[PDB]
Amino acid sequence: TFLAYAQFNDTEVPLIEYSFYSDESLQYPKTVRIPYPKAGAENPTVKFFVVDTRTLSPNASVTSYQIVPPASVLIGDHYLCGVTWVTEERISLQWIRRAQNYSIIDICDYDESTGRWISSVARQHIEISTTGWVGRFRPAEPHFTSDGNSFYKIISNEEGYKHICHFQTDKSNCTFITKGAW
């Protein structure tokens, strides 16, 4: 029913440049240019939209809604790092501060009467690291139950081991279903 996509804006991202000689017959090297942010540089920005492809038609406009990160993340540079569809009316977005020692999972519900995707502090779950970064490379993906009322996801436990915790979609405490020094 819906098609979600992310928009990336690299307007202010510095360009890295290098020569590409190509085939011998090419008389002048071409210069490759890629918006590529290096450490501390200006980063691309992102936007997330949910298109309601049901309205799509030649002489009709695109009906879409923009889901923005939760305040705790909006305050500064962030990255959208995960998108998981829970149900036709529930989508989970996982953001993280440019710092990467703080991420949040925002679970949004579709409002049939207004067409927008609503968020709430009940459905927001924080994950962090005080000794490093979240996830092994990126924060782990949540895994929803078929009704999307709870989900399973990997996080570090009190002992510093990545195990499966169980989260109630609208409750902040989780329970570990695995444990051990592995």
Ligand X SMILES: *[C@@H]1O[C@H](CO)[C@@H](O[C@@H]2O[C@H](CO)[C@@H](O)[C@H](O)[C@H]2NC(C)=O)[C@H](O)[C@H]1NC(C)=O
Q: How far apart are CA 95 and CA 99, in angstroms?
A: 11
Tell me which of 5, 12, 122, 147 binds ligand X, using CB under 6 A: 12
CA 163 remoteness from chain centre: 21
Question: Site for ligand NAG (CB under 6 A): which residue of 59, 61, 113, 173?
Answer: 59
Q: Is residue 111 near ligand NAG by the rule CB under 6 A? A: no
Q: What is the DSSP string of 103-159?
A: EEEEEEEE-TTT--EE--GGGEEEEE-SSS-SSSSSPPPPEE-TTSSEEEEEEE-TT
Dist. CA 161–CA 155, nearest whole Å: 8
Contacts of 26 (CB under 8 A, 6+ apart): none
Task: Of 50, 14, 6, give the one whose Cα is nearest residue 33.
Answer: 14
Asked if 57 touches ligand NAG (CB under 6 A), the answer is: yes
Nearer to ligand NAG, 25 or 57 (CB): 57
Cβ neighbours of 26 (radius 10 Å): 10
When asked if residue 46 is in the footprint of ligand NAG (CB under 6 A), the reply is: no
CB under 6 A: which stretch of 53-61, 139-147, 149-157, 170-178 binds ligand NAG?
53-61
Contact between 138 and its own copies per CB under 8 A: no
140 to 159, contacts with ligand X by CB under 6 A? none
Residue closest to 95 by CA, chosen among 128, 122, 117, 130: 128
CB 17 within 8 A of CB 30: no
119 binds, among ligand X, its own copies, ligand NAG, none (CB under 5 to 8 A by kind): ligand NAG
Tell me which of 6, 26, 41, 62 binds its own copies, using CB under 8 A: 62
Among 9, 31, 55, 66, binds ligand X (CB under 6 A): 9
Pick what 130 binds: ligand X, ligand NAG, its own copies, none; C-beta below 5 to 8 Å, kind-dependent: ligand NAG
Task: Give yes or no for residue 175 binding ligand NAG (CB under 6 A).
Answer: no
Enumerate binding residues for ligand X (CB under 6 A). Answer: 9, 11-12
